[PDB]
Swiss-Prot record, chain B:
This is Beta-galactosidase. Belongs to the glycosyl hydrolase 2 family. The gene is lacZ.
């Protein structure tokens, strides 16, 4: 639903902070992915090759529980129990 | 080689020690019958589950199948009456019965099924009863059952394993008169 | 207009035609004053009444709120009709 | 939703079984009440006076959780936060 490019300056061993502005969220599940790729071609790989990525849960979903009002039928014989609902028979 | 599975703690005998006979059935006949009962959760109303296996040995014409239920009182009811083409098939039926008399060792009420396919006639005695395990307890028609039993060998001091009906009846009456 | 309250899954409640301060002040039935409001209480629980005697006895241990952490929630709706107590927002 | 009269024969000290046929149940909460009343007038009370009753839970309800899709507005000033939803302002 949303993609954005960035550049970060960090020398060997350095830790740097990255700030991501989040949208307003509904009852769905939301995951964030952060990746780093080759800016231009190398002798061993092409521009856009991913070298590193990580993923994080932003928000768990809200589960819905619905009350069913429609009916189910049941027929017994000597070997089988048969259960009918809508247009499926178990 | 059969003798290796017949090593019971008993006398080793031999011979034709039970009855021999010849009988004749129509070309299209009932080979086998399986009658089972169920009872509801109040042990009040019953169901009959009937499997009838038919066998054809060169018949061509269609025959009439009738199944009649006779109650312990003596009343009769037709459960099935249909025409069947001659073939090897298992027919299955399920019937409901209201407040049947239940079979127990204390009260042995027997119903009769009468089955007739053309000129072939057979009868089977059956009872309404249910054995089950609920939470490790043994139940018979919904009540806790205590087995007050004995082991019996089919043995006679004059005839060996060839025991008669008169002796079988003597054994049963003696068992019941001693609370077995 | 209906003010509706439903438990998650239950509450205790009471409604009075005066304040808690009025009820604590007056020592006779005749002195209970006239007010232009209703006091509403919505509760998790209240301690027991006791009465083994009335000169020292306490309510029994199993009817006291001993000081430990507690939580409690309810749903409120203001509308023209009584909704279903069994239906909540996910 | 259902009422039924009965009579039970029990001498002082006796325990007797009572069988109640239950209906098929939906997602509502179901309670059973069993009572005993005076068959005819006495010197101390009238026919229908209850002398004994007990109640039992038959079935707990099935709670419904619904996903809300409609929006809520928020306005801040120096002293108040105001929240609007449908035709209610908090």
């Amino acid at each position: 639903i949303e993609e954005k490019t960035f550049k970060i300056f960090a020398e060997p061993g350095e830790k740097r902070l990255l700030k991501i502005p989040l949208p307003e969220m509904d009852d769905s599940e939301y995951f964030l992915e952060i990746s780093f790729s080759l800016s231009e071609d190398t002798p061993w790989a092409e521009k856009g090759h991913v070298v590193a990525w990580e993923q994080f849960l932003l928000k768990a979903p809200a589960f819905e529980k619905k009350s069913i009002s429609d009916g189910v039928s049941l027929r017994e014989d000597g070997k089988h129990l048969t259960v009918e609902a809508k247009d499926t028979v178990y | 080689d059969g003798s290796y599975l017949e090593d019971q703690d008993m006398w080793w005998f031999a011979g034709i020690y039970r009855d021999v006979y010849l009988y004749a059935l129509p070309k299209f006949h009932i080979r086998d019958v399986f009658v089972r009962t169920d009872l509801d959760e109040n042990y009040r109303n019953g169901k009959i589950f009937l499997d009838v296996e038919m066998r054809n040995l060169g018949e061509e014409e269609e025959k009439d199948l009738e199944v009649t239920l006779i109650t312990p009182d003596g009343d009769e009811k037709t459960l099935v009456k249909e025409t069947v083409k001659p073939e090897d098939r298992v027919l299955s039926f399920a019937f409901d019965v209201k407040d049947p008399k239940k079979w127990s060792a204390e009260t042995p009420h027997l119903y009769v099924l009468k089955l007739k396919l053309g000129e072939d006639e057979k009868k089977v005695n059956f009872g309404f009863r249910k054995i089950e395990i609920k939470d490790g307890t043994l139940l018979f028609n919904g009540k806790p059952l205590y087995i007050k039993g004995v082991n019996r060998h089919e043995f006679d001091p004059d005839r060996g394993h060839a025991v008669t009906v008169e002796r079988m009846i003597q054994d049963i009456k003696l068992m019941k008169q001693h609370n077995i | 207009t209906k003010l509706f309250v439903s438990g998650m899954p239950q509450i205790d409640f009471s409604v009075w035609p005066f304040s808690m301060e009025d009820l604590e002040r007056v020592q006779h039935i005749s002195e209970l004053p006239e007010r232009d409001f209703v006091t509403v209480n919505v509760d998790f629980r209240q301690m027991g009444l006791g009465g083994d005697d009335s000169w020292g006895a306490m309510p029994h241990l199993e009817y006291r709120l001993l000081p430990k952490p507690y939580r409690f929630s309810f749903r409120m709706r203001i509308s023209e009709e009584i909704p279903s107590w069994r239906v909540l927002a996910a």
